[PDB]
């Protein structure tokens, strides 16, 4: 049975080795940039000039093939600018200068990412009602008791979106990413961000349009979106299905520690220099022990930069050699006759 | 007491249910699984809106399910029970109603008048009236111990005066005082009466009723013409159905073992529930008192901590309710039924004989694994290891031996003429009567079936017997149609320790001689002779025969010979005479007449009868000794004839010392300490028990014990214990002369001090409260009243067929059955150990990690079928290998296929497996896209491939713990997977119009992304890494027999079992039977 064994375990290690050295070699080809503006409200200067970001706030992920080190790219630096004259969801702006050390080609993606949120609870990942989402004909009764627990509806009116996931939009924007120092000419280079496909095309369906059964003014919007929504609904229903921020969010993350997809590029470069991205903190995680950060990364074939899975196949193999190698070596010191009657029960004094 | 007048009601109720009352009953004997009232509280808490999670009727269904399937199987075995009593409770008796009118055995109480006539069974206990052949004398058959047929004389007064029904009718003799109804088959009493009776001073005079005079019910298969009797202690009231007992609800030692493992896989639920609720109750307070999005509106009664900590309590025991699956239940329910579908359907334990198959029925379907841990078999001699059926076989004249006779027959030589005597002793010494209703047949009706294959035997082989037409007996010699006449009977019965029995006869020629005819015992007769140097010679010749008959094994009687001057005949005629009124100690003068008469005698010869045992006894007696077995036998026939039967089925060996125990002199205590103390004195286990003759050779010791020392040792406890030390340290205890009670007793003496595994086999109600008393009870089916295959779970024709269904069936179905409960577990603890493990990383709040659809599928279709195959159609070792070499039985004899230490290791290869899927992937989708696409990675694309990851794992890690293999092995290891593959790719592309399906886009979210292909993989090669190395290494290092034997089989198939030096090779006397006085003394009366 060993003679059968001791070739599966190396075939086990020279198919796993090569797939994991590709596993590492492609998400090695990944280039990733985190910021962490959490504490921009506070620790931020906001007189208008940029201190450098403390070192725990941000972290590069350079590629494998990058000339430089991690300590050479300059330390980022951002500002703070909290004024009441702007328009609602614009009043506090933190403004970050990065440096892209490389040229990081077609396939760069932002997204945001959350730490100590958990949209896995299960309050909370049970927390929204698909039928009234989708449109269909609810009641008052039936979404009271719906899943939408505990923002069901008040006075009468139901909440549409109910639930304890569509209360939690994460209503942070970051609208602009600007080179500083274009190559090109001119002042300044727009990187064009693009908030248009950030969801797959089939999470549309879950959501509607407009609602056919209650007039606006029946319906309440839910009680974090007082800010945004003053009056209520009084232009129409949200339109649920024309934006993606909604439905990227409405996805629960598996994870506390969580990436959402906010804006994407895919025809252009993002050139060597210092690039300025602005953010409207609107969504606080200090009060629960949270942060909100930034990140920007690039796609191989594998995805982001996890490497986890190559090295695992990697030690895998290398498991697999050395028992293989053990066990050749116990065969050749006392090798044992297959179906032998010598060690049978009554066969023995 | 009754006082009848010219109770109990009827029928056997073998049944264990009622039409009123079997859902009751049936919901508590399924109740008492644990398990169930789990499965009942889990249903009663979703019932409850806030845990409802599809639909109460659908979280109901299953246990409804479990509940009507387990109810119809119970139904159909009760219903099987039905037909069984209804063809006995149907039968045809014809009781007076002024004629005879047929019954149905319902309606007949206390009273009335039965007319049975012959060769048909007793519908209650009756008390003699009439019959047809003299002194309203009648004769009975076995089934109730014993192995002759006996006689019943008469009721005294009340005999006669009933030999119509006019009489039966035109009299009201009754008011009977019968007793208490007792379980003793030895006491009777009554007295019948009369209505109109006078004695000279007026009273009507009392009739006693004993039971030489009453016959029992359920045994009588009478041998004799009608009779007539009036029906008494009838219905649960009689002896057989007193001395059996209420039919069991027998379980297996695999559920007995099942019930702690459940209960440890509930208190693993409970101890992660109680974390569950204790870390989720503290972190909703601090999250409570920093408002988080996922914890906003928590002040309402039902919604606030506490109250929420206690909601996750009981969602803990909601979500991780597979620790302990319903549908294992249904499984092994259905795998139980099909292995006694095996068992009936196999064609090697099929009889087949004059016409009439009998297959092996199961009539418990569950108890099909608890053949394969049989420690201890108790078997009942009669009808069970024998076929009642007496033939002679060899005969020794004087010097020379016989197995010729015409050709030895030369009229002239002294051989001839001693020929001559022998037969004359054996066709004339017999109280047996011949019937001339067919010429030349001469049917033989004889009380002993020794004196039948005697007599029978002398007719075919020379000397035929005309009959008793008169008081004068006749013979036909094949010379012409001779007769002589018959003298005063001397029979001594074979009682008063009299091993003999003698003949006076006359000879009606003109010679006029008186010869005394003797037949008897070895000793007896060997003593009584006259030998001054020719008889010695011819009685050291005839030793020596005598010895190689009972070396063969035969039961021998030596007949006798004397020729009685007529002066001593007429002396001894008149002492007899003058002693046959002697009052005070009749049986001494008797006794005394007889060894007056005989004072010398010639010897003839002996013979040789053997009691044939059924086909393939002593092989299969073997065979199970092999296997480890300890075989005893239960019978209630007389001491002689079972230690026979014990030496003629290898039960007793040559070289077996034999400790016969008997109540007499010494008490029998004393006489197992004494035993103990001469014969196992040098053991030093016996020292902490001891905290308070005849023989052949050294090398084994036996114990033979009689009823009465029996029922000695179970009235106290050191008696007892003594008892269980001496036949545990026995190879085979031989129980003779035993009440069905005391076979009872003995299964629970074993069952409760020892704690093992036992079996009872047998063909009588005896065997019937035996087979009832044991974990597994077995009945022989034998045309005798079919009592002991209605109160059984197994139903046979043949003790090899026992041999077979212990060996292969038991051992395979224990294997499966263990095999199958294991993997069950270990599926189970791989789908909960992945949540368990995501419920580390989500707070504890007990949240499903996988769509709900992957988890409500995880039994009914992904792993189902590895399972079903495992318990229905695995082998361990071919069947060939498992007949040739009993001794593979060990591993399913000292249970270890099953227990806690394989349950441990499967838990924890589950909870490792789990945590190797769980965390690899996990780890692995810590990421920001998963694909080149840039979507972020949401909790159910991780979820799916751990789902799949794990069913994958699951159905491999079955395949690999199964020996056999062939196509069908593959389609359900691959048929899971292939299910859970195309449902993934199905389920996410319905259009959520259609449906929510809760997973819209996994078609691409996973079949798209490196992670999933690669992280699948990994998963299962890692996860089934440990189990198929453990197995090479457990194979190739530490073998089991069974394994060796596997792969000699597969590698070596030249080998032969059965004669190989290392495999097969290596291996690895007097009876006779009397009715002990009654007809007998009775012929004394007629014929003085
Ligand atoms: C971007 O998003 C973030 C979050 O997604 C937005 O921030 C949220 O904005 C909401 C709207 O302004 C805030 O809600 C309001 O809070 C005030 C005061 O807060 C306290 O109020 C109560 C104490 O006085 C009490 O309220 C309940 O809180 C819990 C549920 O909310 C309950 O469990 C609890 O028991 C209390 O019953 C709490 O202590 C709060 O801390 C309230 O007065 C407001 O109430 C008014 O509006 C509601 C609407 O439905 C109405 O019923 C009331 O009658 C009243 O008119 C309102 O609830 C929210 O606190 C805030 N969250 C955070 C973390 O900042 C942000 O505004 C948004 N920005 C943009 C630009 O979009
Ligand atoms: C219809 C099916 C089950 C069918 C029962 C009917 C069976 C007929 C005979 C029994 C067959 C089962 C196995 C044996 C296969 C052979 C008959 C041996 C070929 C489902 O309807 C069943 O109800 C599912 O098994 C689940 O619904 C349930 O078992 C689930 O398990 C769990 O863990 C959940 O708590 C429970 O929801
Ligand atoms: C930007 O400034 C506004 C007001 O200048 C802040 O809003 C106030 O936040 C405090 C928090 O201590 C509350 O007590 C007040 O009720 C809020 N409103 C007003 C009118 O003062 C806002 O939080 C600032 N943005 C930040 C810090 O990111
Ligand atoms: C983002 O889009 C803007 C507008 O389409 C681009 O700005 C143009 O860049 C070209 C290249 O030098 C100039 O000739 C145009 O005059 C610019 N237009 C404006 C309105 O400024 C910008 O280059 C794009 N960014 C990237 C990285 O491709
Ligand atoms: C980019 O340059 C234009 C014109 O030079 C200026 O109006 C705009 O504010 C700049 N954007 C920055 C510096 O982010
Ligand atoms: F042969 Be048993 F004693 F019925
Ligand atoms: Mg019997």
């Known amino acids: ?39 921009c409200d506070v620790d931020a200067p906001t007189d208008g000039s940029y201190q450098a970001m403390p070192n725990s706030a941000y972290q590069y992920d350079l590629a494998t093939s990058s000339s430089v080190s991690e300590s050479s790219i300059a330390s980022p630096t951002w500002t703070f600018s909290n004024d009441s004259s702007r328009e609602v969801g614009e009043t506090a702006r933190c403004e ?186 609107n969504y606080p995680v200090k009060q629960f022990s949270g942060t909100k950060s930034i990140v920007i990364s690039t796609v191989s074939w594998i995805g982001g930069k996890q490497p986890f899975l190559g090295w695992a196949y990697i030690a895998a193999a290398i498991l697999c050699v050395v028992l293989a190698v053990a066990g050749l070596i116990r065969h050749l010191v006392k090798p044992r006759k297959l179906g032998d009657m010598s060690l049978l029960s009554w066969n023995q004094p | 007491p009754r006082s009848v007048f010219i109770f109990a009601t009827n029928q056997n109720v073998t049944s264990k249910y009622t039409v009123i009352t079997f859902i009751p009953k049936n919901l508590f004997e399924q109740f008492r699984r644990v398990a169930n009232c789990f499965f009942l509280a889990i249903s009663i808490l979703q019932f409850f809106p806030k845990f409802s999670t599809i639909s109460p009727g659908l979280v109901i269904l299953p246990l409804i399910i479990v509940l009507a399937i387990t109810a119809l199987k119970d139904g159909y075995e009760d219903i099987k029970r039905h037909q069984a009593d209804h063809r006995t409770n149907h039968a045809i008796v014809h009781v007076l109603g002024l004629g005879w009118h047929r019954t149905i055995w319902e309606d007949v109480k206390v009273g009335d008048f039965v007319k049975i006539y012959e060769n048909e069974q007793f519908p209650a206990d009756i008390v003699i009236c009439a019959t047809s052949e003299e002194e309203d004398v009648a004769y009975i058959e076995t089934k109730n111990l014993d192995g002759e047929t006996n006689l019943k004389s008469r009721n005294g007064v009340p005999g006669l005066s009933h030999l119509n029904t006019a009489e039966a009718c035109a009299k009201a003799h009754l008011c009977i005082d019968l007793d208490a109804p007792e379980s003793n088959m030895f006491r009777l009493n009554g007295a019948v009466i009369n209505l109109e009776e006078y004695d000279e001073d007026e009273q009507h005079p009392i009739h006693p009723i004993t039971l030489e005079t009453t016959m029992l019910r ?60 204790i870390v989720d109750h503290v972190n909703e307070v601090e999250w409570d008192r920093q408002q988080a999005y996922w914890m906003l509106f928590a002040d309402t009664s039902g919604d606030n901590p506490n109250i929420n900590g206690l909601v996750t309590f009981a969602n803990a025991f909601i979500t991780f309710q597979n620790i302990v699956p319903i549908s294992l239940y249904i499984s092994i329910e259905a795998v139980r039924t099909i292995q006694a579908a095996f068992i009936y359907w196999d064609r090697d334990i099929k009889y087949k004989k004059d016409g009439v198959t009998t297959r092996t029925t199961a009539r418990s379907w569950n108890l099909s694994d608890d053949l394969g841990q049989i420690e201890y078999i108790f078997s009942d001699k009669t009808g069970t290891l024998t076929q009642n059926a007496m033939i002679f076989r060899q005969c020794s004249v004087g010097g020379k031996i016989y197995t010729l006779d015409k050709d030895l027959e030369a009229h002239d030589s002294e051989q001839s003429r ?108 060997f003593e009584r002779l006259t030998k001054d140097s020719n008889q010695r010679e011819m009685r050291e010749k005839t030793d020596q025969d005598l010895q190689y008959f009972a070396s063969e094994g035969l039961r021998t009687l030596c007949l006798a010979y004397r020729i009685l001057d007529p002066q001593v005949y007429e002396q001894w005629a008149k002492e007899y005479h003058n002693a046959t009124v002697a009052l005070q100690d009749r049986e001494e003068r008797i006794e005394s007449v007889s060894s007056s008469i005989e004072r010398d005698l010639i010897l003839l010869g002996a013979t040789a009868i053997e009691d044939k045992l059924q086909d393939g006894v002593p092989d299969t007696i073997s065979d199970l000794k092999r296997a480890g077995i300890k075989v005893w036998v239960a019978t209630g026939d007389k001491l002689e004839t079972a230690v026979a039967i014990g030496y003629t089925t290898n039960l007793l060996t ?16 004393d006489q197992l300490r004494e035993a103990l103390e001469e014969f196992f004195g040098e053991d030093a286990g016996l020292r902490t028990t001891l905290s308070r003759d005849n023989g052949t050779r050294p090398g084994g010791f036996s114990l033979v014990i009689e009823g009465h020392a029996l029922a000695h040792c179970f009235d106290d406890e050191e008696t007892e214990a003594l008892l269980l030390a001496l036949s545990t340290r026995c190879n085979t205890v031989i129980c003779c002369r035993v009440s069905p009670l005391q076979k009872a007793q003995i299964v629970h003496l074993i069952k409760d001090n020892l704690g093992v595994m036992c079996l009872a086999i047998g063909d009588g109600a005896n065997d019937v409260s035996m087979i009832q008393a044991a974990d597994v009870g077995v009945g022989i089916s034998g045309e005798e009243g079919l009592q002991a295959v209605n109160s059984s779970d197994y139903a046979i024709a043949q003790f090899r067929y026992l041999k077979r269904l212990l060996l292969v069936h038991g051992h395979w179905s224990y294997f499966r059955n263990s095999s199958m409960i294991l993997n069950f577990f270990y599926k189970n603890i791989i789908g909960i150990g992945v949540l368990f493990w995501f419920m580390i990383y989500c707070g504890w709040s007990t949240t499903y990690v996988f769509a709900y659809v992957y988890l409500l599928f995880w039994n009914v279709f992904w792993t189902l079928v590895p399972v079903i195959a495992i318990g229905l159609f695995d082998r361990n070792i071919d069947d060939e290998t498992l007949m040739a070499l009993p001794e593979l039985y060990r591993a399913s004899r000292e249970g270890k296929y099953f227990g806690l230490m394989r349950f441990a290791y499967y838990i924890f290869e589950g909870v490792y497996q789990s945590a190797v899927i769980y965390f690899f992937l996990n780890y692995t989708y810590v990421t920001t896209t998963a694909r080149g696409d840039g979507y972020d990675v949401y909790m159910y694309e991780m979820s799916t491939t751990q789902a799949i990851g794990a069913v994958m794992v699951a159905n491999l890690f079955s395949g690999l713990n199964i020996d056999a293999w062939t196509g069908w092995v593959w389609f359900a290891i691959w048929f899971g997977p292939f299910l859970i593959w195309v449902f993934t790719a199905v389920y996410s592309v319905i259009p ?66 059965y004669n190989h030096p290392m495999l097969g090779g290596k291996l690895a006397g007097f009876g006779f039977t009397m009715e002990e006085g009654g007809v007998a003394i009775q012929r004394m009366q007629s014929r003085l």
């Not at chain 1, 198919?15 to 492609?26: D, E, Q, Y």
């Not at chain 1, 050390?101 to 927390?127: A, E, M």
């Not at chain 2, 027998?250 to 639920?269: C, D, F, H, T």
């Open chain 1, 1 to 39: 049975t060993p003679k059968s064994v001791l070739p599966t375990l190396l075939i086990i290690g020279i198919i796993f080795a090569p797939i994991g050295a590709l596993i590492v070699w492609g998400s090695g080809k990944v280039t990733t940039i985190t910021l962490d503006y959490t504490e």
């Open chain 1, 96 to 281: 970050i200068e990065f440096e892209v050390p490389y040229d990081l080609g077609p396939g760069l993606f932002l997204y945001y990412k959350l730490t100590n949120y958990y949209q896995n609870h299960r309050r909370y990942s049970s927390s929204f009602d698909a039928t009234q989402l989708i449109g269909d004909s609810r009641s008052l009764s039936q979404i009271n008791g719906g899943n939408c627990k505990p923002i069901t509806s008040r006075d009468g009116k139901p909440y549409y979106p109910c639930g304890l996931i569509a209360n939690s939009l994460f209503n942070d924007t970051f609208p602009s990413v600007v080179l500083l120092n274009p190559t090109n000419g001119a002042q300044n280079q727009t990187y064009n961000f693009s908030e248009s496909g950030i969801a797959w095309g089939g999470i549309k369906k879950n959501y509607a349009s407009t609602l056919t059964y209650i007039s606006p003014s029946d319906v309440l919007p839910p009680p974090n979106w007082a800010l945004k929504y003053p009056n209520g609904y009084v232009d129409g229903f949200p339109n649920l299905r024309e934006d993606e921020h909604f439905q990227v969010w409405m996805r629960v993350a598996a994870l506390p520690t969580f990436r959402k997809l906010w804006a994407r590029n895919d025809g252009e470069i993002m050139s060597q220099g210092r690039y300025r991205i602005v953010a409207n903190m």
């Open chain 2, 218 to 277: 359920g045994c009588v298969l009478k041998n004799t013409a009608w009779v007539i009797g009036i029906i008494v202690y009838t219905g649960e009231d009689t002896k057989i159905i007193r001395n059996a007992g209420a039919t069991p609800s027998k379980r297996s030692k695999v559920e007995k073992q099942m019930n702690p493992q459940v209960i440890i896989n509930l208190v693993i639920l409970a101890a992660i529930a109680v974390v569950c609720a």
């Open chain 2, 418 to 525: 001693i020929l001559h005597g022998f037969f004359a002793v054996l066709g004339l010494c017999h109280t047996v009567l011949a019937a001339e209703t067919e010429p030349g047949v001469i049917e033989y009706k004889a009380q002993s079936p020794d004196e039948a294959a005697l007599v029978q035997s002398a007719a075919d082989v020379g000397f035929v017997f005309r009959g008793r037409d008169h008081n004068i007996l006749r013979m036909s010699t094949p010379f012409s149609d001779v007769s002589d006449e018959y003298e005063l009977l001397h029979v001594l019965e074979f009682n008063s320790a009299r091993k003999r029995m003698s003949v006076i006869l006359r000879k009606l020629d003109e010679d006029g001689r008186i010869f005394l005819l003797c037949k008897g015992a070895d000793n007896v007769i």
């Open chain 2, 654 to 669: 040559k070289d077996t010392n034999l400790i016969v125990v008997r109540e007499g002199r010494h008490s029998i205590g």
């Open chain 2, 992 to 1057: 959520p119009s259609s449906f929510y399906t809760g997973v819209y886009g996994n078609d691409v979210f996973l079949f798209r992304s490196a992670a999933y292909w690669f992280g699948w993989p990994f998963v299962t090669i890692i996860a089934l890494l440990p189990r198929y190395l453990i197995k090479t290494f457990r194979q190739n290092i530490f073998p089991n027999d069974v394994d060796t034997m596997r792969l000699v089989r597969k590698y070596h198939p030249e080998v032969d079992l």
